[PDB]
Design a protein around this ligand. Structure first.
Ligand SMILES: Cc1ncc(COP(=O)(O)O)c(CN)c1O
Ligand SMILES: Cc1ncc(COP(=O)(O)O)c(CN)c1O
Lengths: 396, 396
């Protein structure tokens, strides 16, 4: 049965990682990483999370299965983060949330749900995006089409190209939007651009699918949800796939959510019953520990305050590295302005380096980025910034 | 897009559960439950698990993502449980294990892997089986066909009917086997019957898929794997979907494994690369906490001993209830043979009650079983056995 199976394509991520580990040079630097690191180069467990885990160790008396949609408090806390306390969507019971194994798990549940219960055949994704978006949607039998996004000359949102691309989208297509901190570019729509897109989406009959993996890493929890909430105010229907992997530092515990929104409570409940069937046929019901930590923290005033400040510390450290990177580069020698780095949001930015410059940075200087030129600014520290920048300047 | 979606079918499980909850009668009894309960009617966190969770709280310093296939130690320990320490499959590196979100997650990964990378179109499942088997395989686009299994006259394995049924299976079809503790019947092949089936499967070109959710609940860890190991000795290729939900009491942490076996190490590694691709496009990588507890316990002599004895305590309590149920039915005036209950394995048995008897049980006596007559003998205790049996005798 298995003798003729073709090996999966290479996987550049695992990948880049292995080469970096094998590298014997001082002082090699990994900017290809996909997680947050603090100023010491570690990805610690958040203190709020440790405190919550201690509470669960002390208080859990069973591991009995959760419901298919997971912990109810997790679902309520999730909708308040997405839509805001007092949102009409919440008041009108127009939204149902399933706890999922990570943001990826939410995307796949959304995809399976749409493939089996609607006429959706196609999902529009930005070029560039997270590379697993195409894999997830194709796995459910959905075609992925790309829309233009990045102005490589100005390192900005090519808004005109975006709108032009998306005019090829038919009514009933899904259009995926990164809620904030676009991966890989760090370039997000302004609020006014979000509002324009919301209006266009209504007119053209798109189903919006928000991928919200970095809430809190651009400007703040509420600010980062402005775009989503502009869409929510304009649409009867939408889906949100959110993730707590980065903003709770809970990557490996697989903590995310798929939130379904419809015109009213009867419609969303009926539709959500099929979303639950899609979950049942995949992993049956979701892993408690990470989501329980999230619910425990979000619903406790003391823990939530500690967590919100840890998330603010992460957001602020990323911003300090963006500033320190620009200063260190090019007040000391470099190319057509790197100030675009200060305006971008989240852990990631395209550096503007070519695939060959990136290879030369790996081979000659032991500095690792992804072939697209994406760098994770949280892999930067005050201590490694000077050598990093000296290497970059050398390949310009 | 969602206005015309059809509601998912009713869900008899949630279902039975809700009706039971709402029932205001003493002394209602729930035998429809799908988990272990101890003699006090609780489903505790195992002590070994609590000890491991304390160790992880003390020692974890990151939640950074696991690899796609999860914790390596979890994989090694899983293969030793399945195949035995010193198995040729292990020595010859013919097996690859992915940590998955529960046994359900393992089944879905197997199904996606098979649908996308092989010519498999059909999976044969016993009639009866766990009702989610059909949903999982269908979700991946695979047809499910049923083979005969249960002799309702003798409360035994209808081995002739099984073999006759399966002769309609074509070469290249998947045949699913429950490894031990068949759900819902508690009826397992004898070792000689497993050996006959292993020979037949080789001759007919079936791909065996073992669903191994109750290792340790029939006779013991090694004994319960005899059937699987008889197949492993005879086949180049097979898949195992195992679960740690029941035997570690880790239901909601979603802890299972999908183990792929091929003729040699080159073939299994190449095929496993596509199994990892199937995982990546689903939930990306698996939840650490439950599997880490399992690896921590299995790889530590002290914890493993505490855990093996807790599992033995569960197996033995189930056996004591089987005996007490048969004795008490006799003593309450059932004038018929229930001795078949003593020979069946695991938490579940068909009581032999009709769907109407089961409804009458619920309505007149507040005793809840599944409509098929399946009862969970771990819902039985020395204290509730007499009323339970009085009610049953009353509807015979
Ligand atoms: C845009 C985007 N979508 C989804 C994911 C997947 O997140 P998770 O690890 O929670 O599955 C990521 C990576 N955090 C991402 O960047
Ligand atoms: C035969 C069978 N297969 C798989 C499962 C699902 O197990 P899990 O909860 O680990 O996904 C069950 C329920 N334990 C089962 O009885």
């Amino acid at each position: 049965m298995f003798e003729n199976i073709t090996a999966a394509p290479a996987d550049p991520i695992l990948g880049l990682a292995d080469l970096f580990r094998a590298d014997e040079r001082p002082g090699k630097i990994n900017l290809g990483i996909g997680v947050y690191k603090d100023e010491t180069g570690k990805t610690p467990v958040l203190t709020s999370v440790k405190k919550a885990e201690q509470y669960l160790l002390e208080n859990e008396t069973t591991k009995n299965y959760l419901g298919i949609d997971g912990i109810p408090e997790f679902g309520r806390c999730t909708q308040e983060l997405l839509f805001g306390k007092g949102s009409a969507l919440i008041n009108d019971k127009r939204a149902r949330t399933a706890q999922t194994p990570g943001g990826t798990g939410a995307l796949r549940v959304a995809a399976d749900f749409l493939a089996k219960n609607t006429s959706v055949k196609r999902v529009w994704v930005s070029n560039p995006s997270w590379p697993n978006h195409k894999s997830v949607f194709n796995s459910a039998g959905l075609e992925v089409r790309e829309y233009a996004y990045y102005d490589a000359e100005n390192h900005t949102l090519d808004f005109d190209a975006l709108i032009n691309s998306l005019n090829e989208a038919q009514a009933g297509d899904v259009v995926l939007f990164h809620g904030c901190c676009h991966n890989p570019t760090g370039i997000d729509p302004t609020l006014e651009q979000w509002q324009t897109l919301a209006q266009l989406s209504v007119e053209k009959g798109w189903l919006p699918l928000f991928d919200f993996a970095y809430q809190g890493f651009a400007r703040g929890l509420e600010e980062d949800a402005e775009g989503l909430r502009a869409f929510a105010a304009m649409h009867k229907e939408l889906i949100v796939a959110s993730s707590y992997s980065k903003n709770f530092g809970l990557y490996n515990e697989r903590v995310g959510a798929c939130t379904l929104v419809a015109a009213d409570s009867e419609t969303v409940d009926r539709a959500f019953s099929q979303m639950k069937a899609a979950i049942r046929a995949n992993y049956s019901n979701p892993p408690a520990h990470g989501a329980s930590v999230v619910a425990t923290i979000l619903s406790n005033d003391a823990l939530r305050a500690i967590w919100e400040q840890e998330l603010t510390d992460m957001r602020q450290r990323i911003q300090r590295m963006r500033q320190l990177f620009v200063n260190t580069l090019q007040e000391k020698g470099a190319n057509r302005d790197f100030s675009f780095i200060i305006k971008q949001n989240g852990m990631f930015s395209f550096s503007g380096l070519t695939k060959e410059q990136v290879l030369r940075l790996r081979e000659e200087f032991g500095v690792y980025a992804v072939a697209s030129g994406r760098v994770n600014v949280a892999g930067m520290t005050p201590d490694n910034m000077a050598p990093l920048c000296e290497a970059i300047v050398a390949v310009l």
